Design a protein around this ligand. Sequence first.
Ligand SMILES: [Cu+2]
Ligand SMILES: [Cu+2]
Ligand SMILES: [Cu+2]
Ligand SMILES: [Cu+2]
Ligand SMILES: [Cu+2]
Ligand SMILES: [Cu+2]
Lengths: 331, 331, 331
Amino acid sequence: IAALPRQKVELVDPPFVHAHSQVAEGGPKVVEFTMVIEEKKIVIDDAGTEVHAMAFNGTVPGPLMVVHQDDYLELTLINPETNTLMHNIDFHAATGALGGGGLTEINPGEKTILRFKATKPGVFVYHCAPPGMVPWHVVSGMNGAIMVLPREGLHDGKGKALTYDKIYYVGEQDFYVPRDENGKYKKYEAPGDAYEDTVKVMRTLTPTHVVFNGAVGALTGDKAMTAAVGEKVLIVHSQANRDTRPHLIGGHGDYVWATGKFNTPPDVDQETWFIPGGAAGAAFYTFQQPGIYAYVNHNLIEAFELGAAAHFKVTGEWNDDLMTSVLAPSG
Amino acid sequence: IAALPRQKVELVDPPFVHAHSQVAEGGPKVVEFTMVIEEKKIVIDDAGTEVHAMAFNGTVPGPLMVVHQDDYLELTLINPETNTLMHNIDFHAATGALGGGGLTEINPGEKTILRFKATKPGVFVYHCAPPGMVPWHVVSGMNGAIMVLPREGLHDGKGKALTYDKIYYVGEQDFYVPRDENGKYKKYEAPGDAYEDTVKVMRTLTPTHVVFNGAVGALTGDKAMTAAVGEKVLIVHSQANRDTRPHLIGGHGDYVWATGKFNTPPDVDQETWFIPGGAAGAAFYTFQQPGIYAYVNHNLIEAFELGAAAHFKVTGEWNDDLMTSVLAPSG
Amino acid sequence: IAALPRQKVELVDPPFVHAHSQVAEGGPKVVEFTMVIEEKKIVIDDAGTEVHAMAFNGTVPGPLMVVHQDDYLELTLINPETNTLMHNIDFHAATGALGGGGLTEINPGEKTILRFKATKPGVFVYHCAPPGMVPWHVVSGMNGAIMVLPREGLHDGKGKALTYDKIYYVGEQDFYVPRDENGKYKKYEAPGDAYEDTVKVMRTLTPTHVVFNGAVGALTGDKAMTAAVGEKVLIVHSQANRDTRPHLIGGHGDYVWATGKFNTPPDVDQETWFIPGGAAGAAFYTFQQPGIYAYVNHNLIEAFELGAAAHFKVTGEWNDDLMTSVLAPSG
Ligand SMILES: [Cu+2]
Ligand SMILES: [Cu+2]
Ligand SMILES: [Cu+2]
Ligand SMILES: [Cu+2]
Ligand SMILES: [Cu+2]
Ligand SMILES: [Cu+2]
């Protein structure tokens, strides 16, 4: 262990992923990561709705950390003195101490370094879990995911290699924002001030917002994910507290590790997949048609009314064999 | 493609499926279908509760279209002048232009003809998706499903052929009917009139009714599905906007393509399967016992309080080896 | 059948399971069980909230009956004179008469004996189902599960034997307890007085309590489940009416029969699995780290707010290779 190569990796904010190789380069190594926890107010919709976010590395969701099976993930978690809450981290990819949550409880002004062997391959969720207030921190955006790639990269049901040209991390967040008697969303001074009202909303099990990358439309318009005809894309998706059902309108999930675990054969030709709360999944797809696509949570109410919708701008040539308008909309 | 044989198919109302062959009869063909959109009031319960349904071919759900892999489904969608809204169709089985929704936007008085190559085998959902009014149209019953059978028919995980004697299509719909201040369901003289009230109910993510084939008890009594001991039946099930967990009371799902995709091996000996919102699944089962069966969404509250329950009247001889009353209810 | 050996089994209260063999002891036999139905007031939390439970063998959930494939489960169901309602039982593992429900309808003062062939291997849910009062009986705790082990014990998806050292049965219950105008849960003299109000809550599809083994924290403290480093544990989990997503915080589900059916290959390296309402599942795990583990329903709100959280006390030596605190929380 002590003789293993140590490698520091620079993280990038989602939906983008930091530099990495699908197939492992070299032997096992201790991959070092560092994340600063930021408690800050963020606007989650076009109506100026604020949320006292608790974010790993300052983003909702936290950045995607990529390592290979049997590598060690050594994370340095820092909680600035400017924060008002104690935080920790639970890596679903880790084994022991509640995923590491019991070994990383840091108060404002403290940091900690946790190391764990990524023994299982797949996309895993990680989240803050302070004893007594687990749901609150998580639904406040304090969660993300990591990808433990098999040493030999991805493969389909029959060992055939699956290599993606691009990879996007879509973190889905269910928010529970309190509203006053008039139906208007409330704003609070400090995070703690919202606790009571937030819990009452949480118990209804009905989120007020279900978003991608921290806000409604965060992945639409000019911030739409891109691709080209013939391009192979891996779309990692996560939900740390509630179920979701990803769907690529106009496309499919050619290979979908619905459970997120690479040793579990992927489903194929998926129209809509399911990811349970507290888990991550990965869908592989080769775009065949150009144009705009809508990647959504297929409970269309949560998608188009609550905000769980994203876009894909794909360049290339249209394929009239696959689809064609024989007669355009006419009288 | 122009040289490919063409065949006009006659659609039938669910739970029945139009004539077709499990094994493809000949090479790829352009299978033609035609559906007229009908906006109509439908009564969903014995309390007289009405819903302004937007139905493909006049039924909720829309009719099941059957084709084989690599065939071309050419649909002529018609929106009569008698309608008030613009409609389109998204085939989850299709690839490109938002499943076709982007090429099929027809206003009242218009029609369009869309053709796509059914490249992936399985049961797929199809539904209307007008930009900005997507969920509303879907929860108004404007959705259905199609089945792209493999050229060589159905097979289990080990390649053994699975030939069914009967096939049924159960479309499950989640309605959100507004109520006045007295708890009485409201009635409207027009679709647009209910819109505002409906959206508010939709946002609670709690349907007022969850029904099979458009209404409570729709598939019972005169409309109870039939079978006979020894008969093999395929029960196709769809839910375009919300999760469901089909269960045959008194029976099982011998083979269940939970994801609805035939290239994804079916689960076996299922008691209750799960179909996420925005997808369709299929269950193959051979009846062993005579009598009535209850096909339900296994959230017993949704099944028996909300309306998600159907029946099966099976004929045949009882099997005392499988089950027997050693001591009938007595003192 | 009469010539087959018979064995009377003494059931034990969950989360424990009665003595049995993983690999079948000889040939097919008629395994006899007896359960007396008890309508009783139970407290579901520390505040003293009571529920007029309907419990098989007097426990919520009912006890786990264990037999082998092709064995005959002969159950003597007794409904005491002291009871006020008619009860029956629906074995999801059984084939015919609504899972046995239609042949076991017994009124207070009556008993019945039902026998069915356990033709399919896996864990199955069993619950009361009085026609017209189905969901009310189930959400009142009248449900449990059975395990039909393959005659050759468990095996992974590749045929390698999977022999557990311990086995626990976690029955998850979704309760719908009415509240008064002050938000305080209501208490009733007779269960009948609760029906109307309870039905109202049930219709919201939002349980007030989601608990393991009949109450919040029922499987914690001195009642916490136990294991040791290197010990293989099988955790059978069931939910007869609502979805759940089991997760062992700090561990994984090495082999998980998410559908609960043994003839369906298990998913591996699971972080969080999914069990649809009206079904049971099983997870196999070999502990590697000592300490406390939280076995929860991963919708953290349901887990830590609603009561779906259990504990595991694991003895043994810490494995620093798997996980270690390089730097404990410090400045
Ligand atoms: Cu935190
Ligand atoms: Cu977790
Ligand atoms: Cu429409
Ligand atoms: Cu769709
Ligand atoms: Cu009962
Ligand atoms: Cu049942």
